RNA sequence: UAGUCUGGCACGGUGAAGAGACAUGAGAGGUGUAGAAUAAGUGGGAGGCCCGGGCCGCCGGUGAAAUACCACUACUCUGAUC
RNA sequence: GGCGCGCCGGGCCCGGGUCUUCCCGGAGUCGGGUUGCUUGGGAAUGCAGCCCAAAGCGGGUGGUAAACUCCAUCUAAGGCU
RNA sequence: CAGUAACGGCGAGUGAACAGGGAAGAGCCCAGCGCCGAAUCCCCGCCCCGCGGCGGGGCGCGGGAAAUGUGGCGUACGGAAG
């Protein structure tokens, strides 16, 4: 049959052939490059960790993972940051275990 | 106070015998004085109106950028930088990138190599063919001293020494039970 | 349920400086765990699908009323009649003789049932379960189930270990001997909470190599 | 300067056309004017405008081709001309322009009386609306139950 | 470039290095006066960002400001009002302690112009801020065509009219749906417009 | 509501005497009938080892896996700490 | 006072289109908890004190608190006009 | 827009914004990342024109600032080199 472009439903609104471009150079901000990855991993080695990072790390050596999230969350603030923080701390701890055997 | 090894590592300074040999080598590859520059511009006109030498790379930014680039043969650091955050990391950089480094006493002494007051860091980027051997016998005795002791340096807390009359009270209490 | 994930699904490579071998071998994977209860209703089973030529070794067998007498006596089908397997189950308790001479069977096509009385079913609690894939693509139709999905048994060691590859199948083809294996280690993964601790991607002759 | 053609947002108004702020850089690019020359020869430039559609683009490219044809350009030193300038014929006939340059009027298409097709009369436009409404509403849990199924 | 290292090294404040450095510096800073001069910036890298150059005419003052909130200065803690305005203890000052440090630096050094301020350590009863001040009549600044915006009289006492960065943060202005109470110039301009009755001559 | 009393967090450190840890390198370590044998066991395994023979074996003999043949993690004592 | 021809002084000796090859950023700050004020802003619009305090395929916003998930839209904590 | 969405012993009262039409219309710069021998800036002393907004030129192994980073290139609309 014939189907008219309607203003309500799933595929609503005025049909137009859309041109897709590159995004602007503003959209790429907060992307890790090799040179600035280097600097963070150097000053990790110089400094170390915060007394709340070490406490959440020695929670994850004993494998109280839910309590590690709950602790990192009540310290840092919200869920998504505490999720990303634990996912990083566990990868630091797994790299230590890669150094444990060799 | 219980001083951390990143700060404390600047109190393990290069010995007097080596530091004299180092400043004797450093004294030949000076940057030109601001009055030395003009007599080089006197020597322009003989082709114009009618091939650049090795110096010490001065400052922290323009030594840091040629430690990361594999362009430093030996990096000299002053032990007494006024805010220490400027220089704390260059031990780590030079070790990781495989640059031999030494720590000297006196940024005033290291700034008298250049023609200013103070200069925190001073690097050897290149030297000449006849002065290769002096740089070679320096890097030997410096790289065995600093870069290879680095797992030792990193775990070494300075300070935590009580006053002499608090120590002398402890020693009296110690021989009072013997 | 999922304790581990992969993105650097690599680092098998440093192999030739380890393995300087000539003779019959088969490389196997050691992959140690923690937190399993061997006393409870906690199960851990499955058969993890590698279609890329791993090697078990056993007492062979091959079933079926196929074109078997032509095709399947290349590697010797010793086709005993399904009515001459009545001994295997009735010579179980009154007799004391291990009457197998067999450790690996078939699951045939051209017949759509195996034997629906108590001789086909009969293999349900003997281990060595007739399961395999030979039917009507007819690609290899025999050695597919040696070159098969890799089998493990959960017991009183609360550990997983399983074969990966043959002294064959170069290191760009034996990186692919875990690729459709570690994704089924997060797929059919039950309430055995925080299992994995060691992922030792092993070349048998050399050093314990770890991939965590 | 010359302002570009721009659709009003928000369904109430999007059947109209305004004067926009300035010509997008990807309209200048495909029209072949530099973004730092455009402003000096009297073309408004917006560095914020995105181009979702190619008709919104192509209208504003043909806008600049008409403008660059209409534009008379004087010599930077009036006694000695340069290449990209106009002829002395046009320079003496050049005049101050009154009101908005190449003004933006809002024209609609002309649809001739056609014979209504046997299907066109047959189409149930109300039922189509009502069943498009329910397909939009219930779709989410229709996918959920089909996933659980 | 070292400044990238010093930037990231100053972000790891609860490290071994920084928790020591901030402690021995916060010691040192208590043993001088409340408003005194530094010969160079504590944080060279941070002053770089906030608009300092290392030429003559750039001055750094180091101001300590007493921590805590603001209590209502009424005799014998008794406000003569309705129970709403019985607030004495738990009131808070609408400007920040960083902006207070800016306005003391500015008020003292009346002939200089407050550019920016940055945190250099805090205590239990004190916060310490190093404020950048510029001499507008020095020819180094006065003959440089990109820093002679401060040599106009419009930028007299920027800290006190609240044009500085810590000052601006108190006014509650910016673009969008959250800053609808400072449309126009500022909080007052918005109030004035919306309460000004516009009696047209024709009506 | 000022004030006062009380609890928590921050400035706020260092040390010795007295537990569970775990990071972490170890050594002891296991008894179901039943088999000739105190089965901590999986992916192996008819084979590999030391002076060419042996070696431990094979089969059955107990049971859904079984003793020689790379290495691992765990559990109950023990045990050193930058 | 203002402007243009030109005499005349000084400086500056400087463009674009396309591929290949590098680089990319503001921290006791965002953010969260609580308290007080403020708002048309309602499980909290803005501002502030104290405690906790980040990330980089991030972060902010998407007028109802929260989890999972696509999508849109900007690039905060430096400055002039 | 609008006495509207919203706040309010949801009482008395309080109360914006987007879209749209105009008035006006204008855009930019650092730090950072990096390369250019600090290529950058302030001030004294002598000479000449000549400045009731103290400026241009010559001259000086005259003095200082500054590698704890001055100037040139360059900033999210991408930038730089070949």
Q: Is the Cβ atom of A28 within 7 Å of strand F at any atom? A: no
3-state class (DSSP) for residue E67: coil
Give the tokens for residue C54.
């791993």
Give yes or no for a contact between C201 and C90, defined as CB atoms under 8 angstroms apart.
Answer: no
What is the rounded CA–CA span in Å between residue D120 and residue C180?
Answer: 54
DSSP code at position C186:
T
What's CA B31's distance to the chain center, in Å? 17
Please indicate whether, in this complex, the C-beta atoms of E4 and A47 are within 8 angstroms of each other. Answer: no
Please indicate whether, in this complex, the C-beta atoms of A16 and D55 are within 8 angstroms of each other. Answer: yes
CA–CA distances in Å: residue E184 to residues E160, E163, E165, E169, E191: 21, 16, 19, 17, 10
- Report the residue numbers after which chain E has a gap, meaning the C atom sits over 2.5 angstroms from the next written residue's N, or none: none
Give the tokens for residue D66.
């008409």
CA–CA distances in Å: residue D138 to residues A3, A58, D143: 21, 48, 9
Buried b / exposed e along A70-95 (16+ C-beta atoms within 10 A): ebbbebbeeeeebeebbeebbeeeee
Q: How many CA atoms lie within 13 A of D54 on its CB side?
A: 7
Residues 6 or more apart whose Cβ sits within 8 Å of residue B163: none
* Secondary structure (H, E, C), chain B: CEECHHHHHHHCCCCHHHHHHHHHHHCCCCCCCCCHHHHHHHCCCCCCCCCCCCCEEECCHHHHCCCCCCCCCEEEEECCCCCHHHCCCHHHHHHHCCCCEEEECCHHHHHCCCCCCCCCEEEECCCCHHHHHHHHHHHHHHHCCCCCCHHHHCCCCEECCCCHHHHHHHHHHHHHHC
Give yes or no for a contact between C157 and C36, defined as CB atoms under 8 angstroms apart.
Answer: no
- Name the one residue in this structure whose structure tokens are 């901000």: A29
Give yes or no for a contact between C1 and C189, defined as CB atoms under 8 angstroms apart.
Answer: yes
Question: In this structure, what are the phi and psi dihedrals at residue E173, rounded to the nearest 5 degrees?
Answer: -125, 165
3-state class (DSSP) for residue C89: helix
CA–CA distances in Å: residue C93 to residues B5, B112, B122, B130, C8: 76, 101, 90, 96, 54
Give yes or no for a contact between E108 and E133, defined as CB atoms under 8 angstroms apart.
Answer: no
Instruction: Classify residue E98 by burial, with Cβ atoms within 10 Å: 0-12, 13-18, 19+.
Output: buried
Q: Write out the H or E segment, with its range, that includes residue D6.
A: strand D5-7
What is the rounded CA–CA span in Å between residue E183 and residue E190?
Answer: 6
Question: What is the interface size between A and C, counted as CB pairs within 8 Å?
Answer: 12
Residues 6 or more apart whose Cβ sits within 8 Å of residue E77: E88
What is the rounded CA–CA span in Å between residue B92 and residue B6?
Answer: 9
Buried b / exposed e along A27-60 (16+ C-beta atoms within 10 A): eeeeeeeeeeeebeebbeebbbbeeebeebbebb
Nearest in space to D106 (alpha carbons), one of D16, D21, D2: D16
Give the tokens for residue A92.
């630091």
Give yes or no for a contact between B54 and B126, defined as CB atoms under 8 angstroms apart.
Answer: yes
- Report the residue numbers after which chain A has a gap, meaning the C atom sits over 2.5 angstroms from the next written residue's N, or none: none
CA–CA distances in Å: residue D55 to residues A15, A17, B5, D6, D34: 11, 8, 66, 11, 22
Residue among C194, C197, C210 whose CB faces A65 most closely: C194
What is the rounded CA–CA span in Å between residue E147 and residue E29?
Answer: 31
- Strand spans (E) along chain C: 26-31, 47-48, 150-151, 160-166
What is the rounded CA–CA span in Å between residue C115 and residue C112?
Answer: 10
3-state class (DSSP) for residue C164: strand
DSSP code at position D45:
B
Q: How many CA atoms lie within 13 A of E124 on its CB side?
A: 0
Give yes or no for a contact between E18 and E12, defined as CB atoms under 8 angstroms apart.
Answer: yes
- Per the structure, the residue whose CA is closest to nucleotide G79 at C1' is E51
What's CA C91's distance to the chain center, in Å? 28
What is the rounded CA–CA span in Å between residue E101 and residue E127?
Answer: 9
Long-range contacts of C82-91 (CB under 8 A, 24+ apart): C82/C114, C82/C115, C82/C119, C82/C120, C85/C115, C85/C119, C85/C122, C86/C119, C88/C119, C88/C122, C89/C118, C89/C119, C89/C122
- Per the structure, the residue whose CA is closest to nucleotide H77 at C1' is D47
Nearest in space to B95 (alpha carbons), one of E12, A46, E15: A46
Nearest in space to E32 (alpha carbons), one of E9, E11, E61, E1: E61
Q: Write out the H or E segment, with its range, that includes residue E134.
A: strand E126-134
Q: How many CA atoms lie within 13 A of B12 on its CB side?
A: 20
Residues 6 or more apart whose Cβ sits within 8 Å of residue C136: C109
Q: Is C169 left (phi over 0), alpha (psi -120 to 50) or beta?
A: left
Q: How many CA atoms lie within 13 A of A54 on its CB side?
A: 8
- Name the one residue in this structure whose structure tokens are 């609408």: E94
- The residue of chain B with its CA nearest to that of E5 is B89
What is the rounded CA–CA span in Å between residue E58 and residue E52?
Answer: 7
3-state class (DSSP) for residue D22: coil
CA torsion E51-E110-E140-E43 (nearest 10°) is -30
- The residue of chain E with its CA nearest to that of B8 is E17
Nearest in space to C175 (alpha carbons), one of C27, C60, C13: C13
Cα R_g (chain B), whole angstroms: 21
Strand partners, D5: D19
Q: Is B81 left (phi over 0), alpha (psi -120 to 50) or beta?
A: beta
Nearest in space to A39 (alpha carbons), one of B134, B122, E5, D126: E5
- The residue of chain A with its CA nearest to that of C6 is A91
Q: Is the Cβ atom of C47 within 7 Å of strand F at any atom? A: no
| Chain A residues lying within 8 Å of E6, measured CB to CB | none
What is the rounded CA–CA span in Å between residue B152 and residue B155?
Answer: 6
The CA angle A46-A48-A54, to the nearest 5 degrees, is: 175
Sign of the CA dihedral running A12, A14, A16, A20? negative
End-to-end CA distance of chain D: 63
* Most B CBs within 10 Å, among E1, E2, E9, E60, to test the B interface: E2
Residues 6 or more apart whose Cβ sits within 8 Å of residue E117: E50, E98, E99, E101, E102, E105, E129, E130, E131, E132, E164, E165, E166
CA torsion B6-B9-B11-B17 (nearest 10°) is -150
Nearest in space to D5 (alpha carbons), one of D25, D29, D23, D30: D23
Q: What is the DSSP string of E142-168?
A: HT-TTS-STTSGGGSSHHHHT-SHHHH
What is the rounded CA–CA span in Å between residue B66 and residue D42?
Answer: 48
What is the rounded CA–CA span in Å between residue B33 and residue B13?
Answer: 29
CB-contacted nucleotides of strand G (7 Å): 5-6, 16-17, 23-32, 35-41, 45-59, 61-63, 66-68, 73-75, 77-81
Q: Is the Cβ atom of C133 within 7 Å of strand F at any atom? A: no
The CA angle C69-C75-C80, to the nearest 5 degrees, is: 50
Distance E197 CA to G40 C1' (A): 19
Give the relative orientation of helices A51-60 and A65-76 as an angle to the nearest 10 degrees.
Answer: 160
What is the rounded CA–CA span in Å between residue D46 and residue D52?
Answer: 15
Establish if A45 touches chain B: CB-CB under 8 angstroms. yes
Give yes or no for a contact between D61 and D43, defined as CB atoms under 8 angstroms apart.
Answer: no
Strand partners, E133: E59, E114
Q: What is the DSSP string of C92-105?
A: SSS--------S--
What is the rounded CA–CA span in Å between residue E194 and residue E203?
Answer: 19
In the structure, do chain C and chain E come into contact, i.e. share 3 or more CB pairs under 8 Å? Answer: no
What is the rounded CA–CA span in Å between residue D85 and residue D71?
Answer: 10
Q: Which chains touch A (3 or more CB pairs under 8 A)?
A: B, C, D, E
Strand partners, E66: E126
What is the rounded CA–CA span in Å between residue D93 and residue D105?
Answer: 27
What's CA C19's distance to the chain center, in Å? 24
CA torsion A93-A97-A102-B6 (nearest 10°) is 30
- Name the one residue in this structure whose structure tokens are 């990192």: A72
What's CA B138's distance to the chain center, in Å? 13
Establish if E2 touches chain A: CB-CB under 8 angstroms. no
What is the rounded CA–CA span in Å between residue C68 and residue C79?
Answer: 8
Give yes or no for a contact between C10 and C202, defined as CB atoms under 8 angstroms apart.
Answer: no
Give yes or no for a contact between E137 and E113, defined as CB atoms under 8 angstroms apart.
Answer: no
Q: Which chains touch E (3 or more CB pairs under 8 A)?
A: A, B
- The residue of chain B with its CA nearest to that of E23 is B1
Nearest in space to B72 (alpha carbons), one of B84, B91, B57: B57
CB-contacted nucleotides of strand F (7 Å): 1-3, 10-14, 21-25, 40-46, 48, 59-65, 70-74, 82
What is the rounded CA–CA span in Å between residue B41 and residue A88?
Answer: 58
Give the tokens for residue B54.
């090795």
What is the rounded CA–CA span in Å between residue C153 and residue D7?
Answer: 68
């Amino acid at each position: 049959a014939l189907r008219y472009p309607m203003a309500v439903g799933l595929n609503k609104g005025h049909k137009v052939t859309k041109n897709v471009s590159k995004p602007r150079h503003s959209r790429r901000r907060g992307r890790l490059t090799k040179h600035t990855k280097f600097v963070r991993d150097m000053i990790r080695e110089v400094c170390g960790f915060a007394p709340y990072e070490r406490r959440a790390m020695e929670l994850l050596k004993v494998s109280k993972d839910k309590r590690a999230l709950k602790f990192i969350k009540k310290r840092v603030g919200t869920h998504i940051r505490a999720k990303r923080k634990r996912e990083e701390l566990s990868s630091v701890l797994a790299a230590m275990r890669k150094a444990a055997a060799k | 106070l219980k001083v951390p090894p990143a700060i404390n590592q600047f109190t393990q300074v290069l010995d007097r015998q080596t530091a004299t040999q180092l400043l004797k080598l450093a004294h030949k590859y000076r940057p030109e004085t601001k009055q030395e520059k003009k007599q080089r511009l006197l020597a322009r006109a003989e082709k114009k109106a009618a091939k650049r030498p090795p110096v010490l790379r001065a400052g922290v930014n323009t030594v840091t950028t040629l430690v990361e680039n594999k362009k430093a043969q030996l990096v000299v650091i002053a032990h007494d930088v006024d805010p220490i955050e400027l220089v704390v990391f260059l031990p780590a950089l030079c070790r990781k990138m495989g640059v031999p480094y030494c720590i000297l006493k006196g940024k005033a002494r290291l700034c008298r190599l250049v023609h200013r007051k103070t200069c925190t860091t001073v690097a050897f980027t290149q030297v000449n063919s006849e002065d290769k051997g002096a740089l070679a016998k320096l890097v030997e005795a410096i790289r065995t001293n600093y870069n290879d002791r680095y797992d030792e340096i990193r775990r070494h807390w300075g300070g935590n020494v009580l006053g002499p009359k608090s120590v002398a009270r402890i020693a009296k209490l110690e021989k009072a039970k013997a | 349920s999922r304790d581990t994930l992969y993105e650097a699904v690599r680092e098998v490579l440093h192999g030739n400086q380890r393995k300087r071998r000539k003779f019959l071998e088969t490389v196997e994977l050691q992959i140690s765990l923690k937190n399993y209860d061997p006393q409870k209703d906690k199960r851990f089973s499955g058969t993890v699908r590698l279609k890329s030529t791993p090697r078990p070794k056993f007492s062979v067998c091959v079933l079926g009323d196929q074109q078997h007498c032509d095709e399947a006596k290349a590697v010797d089908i010793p086709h005993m009649d399904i009515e001459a397997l009545k001994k295997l189950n009735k010579n179980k308790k009154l007799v004391k003789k291990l009457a197998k001479k067999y450790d690996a069977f078939l699951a045939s096509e051209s017949l759509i049932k195996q034997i629906p009385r108590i001789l086909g079913p009969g293999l349900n609690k003997a281990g060595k379960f007739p399961s395999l894939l030979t039917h009507n693509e007819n690609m290899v139709a025999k050695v597919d189930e040696v070159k098969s999905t890799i089998k493990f048994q959960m017991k009183k060691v609360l550990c997983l270990a399983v074969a990966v590859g043959h002294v064959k199948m170069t290191d760009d083809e034996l990186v692919y001997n875990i690729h459709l294996a570690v994704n089924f280690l997060v797929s059919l993964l039950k309430k055995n909470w925080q299992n994995v601790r060691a992922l030792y991607i092993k070349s048998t002759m050399g050093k314990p190599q770890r991939l965590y | 300067p010359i302002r570009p053609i721009v659709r009003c947002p928000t369904v109430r108004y999007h059947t109209k056309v305004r004067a926009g702020r300035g010509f997008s850089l990807e309209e200048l690019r495909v029209a072949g004017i530099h973004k730092k020359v455009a402003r000096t020869i009297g073309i408004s430039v917006d560095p914020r405008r995105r181009n979702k559609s190619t008709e919104s683009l192509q209208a504003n490219v043909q806008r600049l081709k008409e403008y660059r044809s209409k534009l008379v350009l004087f010599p930077r030193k009036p006694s000695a001309p340069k290449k990209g300038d106009s002829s002395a014929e046009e320079l003496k006939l050049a005049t101050q322009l009154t009101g908005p340059v190449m003004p933006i009027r809002n024209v609609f298409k002309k649809e001739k009386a056609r014979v209504i097709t046997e299907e066109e009369k047959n189409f149930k436009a109300f039922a189509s609306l009502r069943m498009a409404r329910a397909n939009a509403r219930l779709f989410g849990i229709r996918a959920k139950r089909a996933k659980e199924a | 470039g070292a400044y990238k290292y010093i930037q990231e090294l100053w972000r790891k404040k609860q490290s071994d290095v920084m928790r020591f450095l901030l402690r021995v510096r916060c010691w040192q800073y208590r043993q001088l006066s409340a408003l005194h001069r530094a010969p160079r910036p504590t944080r060279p890298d941070k002053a770089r960002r906030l608009g300092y150059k290392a030429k003559q005419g750039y001055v750094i003052y180091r101001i300590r400001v007493r921590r805590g909130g603001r209590k209502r200065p009424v005799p014998k803690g008794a406000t003569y009002g309705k129970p709403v305005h019985h607030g004495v203890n738990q009131l808070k000052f609408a400007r920040s302690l960083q902006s207070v440090a800016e306005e003391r630096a500015g008020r003292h050094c009346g002939a200089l112009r407050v550019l920016n301020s940055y945190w250099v350590g805090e205590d239990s009863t004190y916060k310490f801020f190093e404020v950048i001040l510029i001499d507008p009549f020095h020819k180094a600044i006065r003959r440089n065509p990109d820093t002679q915006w401060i040599t106009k009289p419009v930028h007299k006492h920027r800290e006190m009219r609240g044009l500085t960065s810590a000052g601006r943060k108190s006014r509650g202005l910016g673009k969008g749906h959250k800053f609808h109470h400072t449309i126009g110039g500022s909080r007052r301009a918005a109030w004035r417009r919306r309460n000004t009755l516009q009696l047209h001559r024709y009506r």
